[PDB]
Amino acid sequence: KTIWLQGFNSKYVNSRNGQGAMWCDSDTPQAWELFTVIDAGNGKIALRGNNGLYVSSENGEQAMTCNRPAINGWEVFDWISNSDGSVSLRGSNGMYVSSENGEQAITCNRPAIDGWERFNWAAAT
């Protein structure tokens, strides 16, 4: 139930310990790159980061974060299994989580899946 997410730039999604926004900038998956997948009901998931806080879409109004203390909503996502075995994540605003190729903090404001919105994943163990 613990995973990492590897973005388009081959880097790993980084919680940044809840200090600022999340980035897809880590060269290897260590503690801040591991997320506990939480079954949130209704076929949705949430993600709890290294700091015990929850990943938020921020409804696409600003870059994604991992510092919400509880799940509401903007903290639940549809897990989309892609044909190649990658995953995409659709926030509750209907937009997709984007690595932004590591050039800016991760966002959830894209209406369609492109390369930056596809992640390789694996159970951390």
Residue numbers in the entry: 888 to 1012
Sentences from the paper on this structure:
Soil and marine bacteria secrete such enzymes to scavenge nutrition, and they often use CBMs to improve reaction rates and retention of released sugars. Here we present a structural and functional analysis of the recently established CBM family 92. All proteins analysed bind preferentially to β−1,6-glucans.
To probe the mode of binding of CBM92 domains, we successfully determined the protein structures of the C. pinensis proteins CpCBM92A and CpCBM92B by macromolecular crystallography. As was predicted by sequence analysis, both proteins form a β-trefoil structure comprised of 12 β-strands arranged into 3 subdomains (α, β, and γ), similar to β-trefoil domains found in Fascin and CBM13 proteins. We present crystal structures for two exemplary proteins cloned from the genome of C. pinensis, CpCBM92A and CpCBM92B, in complex with ligands. The binding cleft Arg residue in the β-subdomain of CpCBM92B is found in subdomains β and γ in both CpCBM92A and -B, but is substituted with a Ser in the binding clefts of subdomain α in both proteins. For CpCBM92F and AaCBM92B, which both lack one functional site, binding is compromised compared to wild type CpCBM92A and CpCBM92B, which both have three binding site Trp residues.
